[PDB]
Amino acid sequence: PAFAVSDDFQGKYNQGKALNMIRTFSGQGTVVWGARTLEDSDNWRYIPVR
Amino acid sequence: PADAWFVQVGKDLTMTQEEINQGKMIIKIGLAAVRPAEFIILQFSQD
Amino acid sequence: TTTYPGVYLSEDAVSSFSVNSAATAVPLFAYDSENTNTINKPIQVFRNWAEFTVEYPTPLEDAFYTSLSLWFMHGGGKCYLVNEANIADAVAQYDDITLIVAAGTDTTTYTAFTTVVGQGYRIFGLFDGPKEKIAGTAKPDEVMEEYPTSPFGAVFYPWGTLASGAAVPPSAIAAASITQTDRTRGVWKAPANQAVNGVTPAFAVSDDFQGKYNQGKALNMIRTFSGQGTVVWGARTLEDSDNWRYIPVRRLFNAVERDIQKSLNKLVFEPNSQPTWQRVKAAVDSYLHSLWQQGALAGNTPADAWFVQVGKDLTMTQEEINQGKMIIKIGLAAVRPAEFIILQFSQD
């Protein structure tokens, strides 16, 4: 990743829409992170259930 | 799993007479899907 | 909130409670502020014999010196010594003081005593008997009115003169009986058969002058016997009342609540909910039940030997809940001291 992003700038953009930044950890490295569609709706969040 | 879905098709619960006579058939289902466990909180207690 | 994806965590919030027991004897000692052979610091905060002796290596004969000698002869505790001018002050401060002695100091003492009980700070003071030798031919009550009536106190006449040294007020002397009472067993036991050591009463009093002054008020002379020597004798508060005679049953409720009222100070500003109310009830009863199975309080099936009640309408109804107020109430069976003994024969 160009950027090792955050937890809070991560966390504060978890809502609203579908930012879904891709964050490197320990163990898991450069792993994908967060699953959500554009609407934060009870029918449609969570891209696989869409 | 007939709770985890349902399914229904008939003569009048679905697709009544004249639209059968119009050729149309309609069906319908609805179902229980999984949801991804995105968040994790956990609770302690000393009982 | 649960903002980013990942692992959040919660715990348990609030727990139970119980009361923390007691001290049962924190006496301040009646320092005389006019007195000079002494520290003219009014309030002396004293722990044991050692710092006393680094304060007084000096064998005095004034009664407080004879007190702490006698007091720490019985062990003794962290006991204080304030003047006759600063009674209420440290009582408003130190929050532990259980006992108030009379070191022959009465005049401002009784007023300051009846001052603080005029705001009622849950203490048991105790006074001196008159100095010497009521003739007893007459005059039966006119030796008593000099002492304020209260459910809090007695005088213990004979002026146990402590033949090693100076004449000691039995306020100091009977406290030693209590000192070996709580150390022996608690407060509901009456310190009425603890024998003290090396102290001689000025007077070997009577049985009848004893017996005729057993009533009215709380003379409670301290009489030497055989076997038991110079032992304390008679337990009764100032009023001869069915609620209050028998100083430990007064001192029981003097001790029954200062633990509790202290303990629940942490528990205000709390949501006055029903599951609060039952939970509060759940802690006390067992502590009572222990204390009942201690035999401190009398009565079988001990929810007979007490009761306890708190709710929404049996106690603390709606608008005063809406006023924030909660009220509770209990009542209970206590022991009473078997002071008297008669016994009946029959040939059947």
Both tokens assigned to B47: 């009982």
Residue (of C342, C108, C344, C152) closest to C249 by Cα position: C152
> What are the angstrom distances between the C-alpha of C53 and each of C26, C36, C47, C163?
20, 18, 11, 22
Calculate ∠ Cα C201-C251-C288, nearest 5°: 140
Q: Taking a C-beta distance cutoff of 8 angstroms, is the pair C136, C209 a contact? A: yes
> Token digits for C282?
């759940």
- Look at residue C235 and give its three-state secondary structure: coil
Longest Cα separation, chain B: 69
Task: Give the closest of A8, A12, A34 to C5, CB-based.
Answer: A34
Distance from the Cα of B1 to chain A's closest Cα (Å) equals: 18
Q: Is A12 within 8 Å of C5 when comparing Cβ atoms?
A: no
Residues of chain C with C-beta less than 8 angstroms from the C-beta of A11: 3-4
Chain A residue with minimal CA distance to B35? A49
Residue C259, CB half-sphere, CA atoms under 13 Å: how many? 16
Q: Name the H helices within C74-206.
A: 87-94, 107-117, 170-185
Enumerate residues 6+ apart whose C-beta is below 8 A from A5. Answer: A21, A23
In angstroms, the separation between the Cα of residue B36 and the nearest Cα of chain C is: 11
Chains A–B, number of C-beta pairs less than 8 Å apart: 12
Given a contact cutoff of 8 angstroms between Cβ atoms, the answer to whether C254 and C123 are in contact is yes
> Hey, are the CB atoms on A34 and C3 less than 8 Å from each other?
no
Resolution in A: 5.4
Report the distance separating Cα B15 and Cα C203, nearest Å: 116
Angle between helices C107-117 and C87-94 (to 10 degrees): 40
d(CA C131, CA C104): 9
Q: Which experimental technique did the depositors report for determining this structure?
A: cryo-EM
Give yes or no for B34 touching C (CB within 8 A).
no
A34 to chain C, closest Cα gap in Å: 6
* Local structure of residue C80 (DSSP, 8 states): E
DSSP string for residues in B6-35:
EEE--SSSSS-HHHHHTT----EEEE----
Asked if residues C156 and C126 have their Cβ atoms less than 8 Å apart, the reply is yes
Structure tokens at C257: 């609540």
Please tell me the total number of residues recorded for chain B in this structure: 47
From CA C31, how far away is CA C114, in angstroms rounded? Answer: 18
Q: What is the DSSP string of A1-47?
A: ------SHHHHTTSSSS-----B--SSS-SB------SS--SSS-ST
A35/B36 touch (CB, cutoff 8 Å), yes or no: yes
Which DSSP state fits B43? B
Chain B CB contacts of C15 below 8 Å: 46
B37 touches chain C (CB under 8 A): no
Tokens 């039940």 belong to C289
- List Cα–Cα distances, C204 to C154, C207, C233, in angstroms: 19, 10, 12
Phi, psi (rounded to 5 degrees) for C323? -80, 5
3-state secondary structure at position C127: coil
- How far is the C-alpha of C215 from the C-alpha of C141, rounded, in Å? 10
SS3 C326: coil
Classified as helix, coil or strand, C262 is helix
Q: Is residue C185 packed enough to be buried (19+ CB in 10 Å), middle (13-18) or exposed (0-12)?
A: exposed
- What pairs with residue C81 in β-bridges? C29, C44
Alpha-carbon span C199 to C175, nearest angstrom: 13
Question: Measuring CA to CA, which residue among A48, A47, A50, A49 is closest to residue A18?
Answer: A47
Pairing of strands B28-31, B5-8: antiparallel
Positive/negative CA dihedral, A36, A39, A40, A45: negative
Instruction: Kindly report the backbone phi and psi dihedral angles of residue B8, in degrees, each rounded to the nearest multiple of 5, phi listed first.
Output: -155, 130
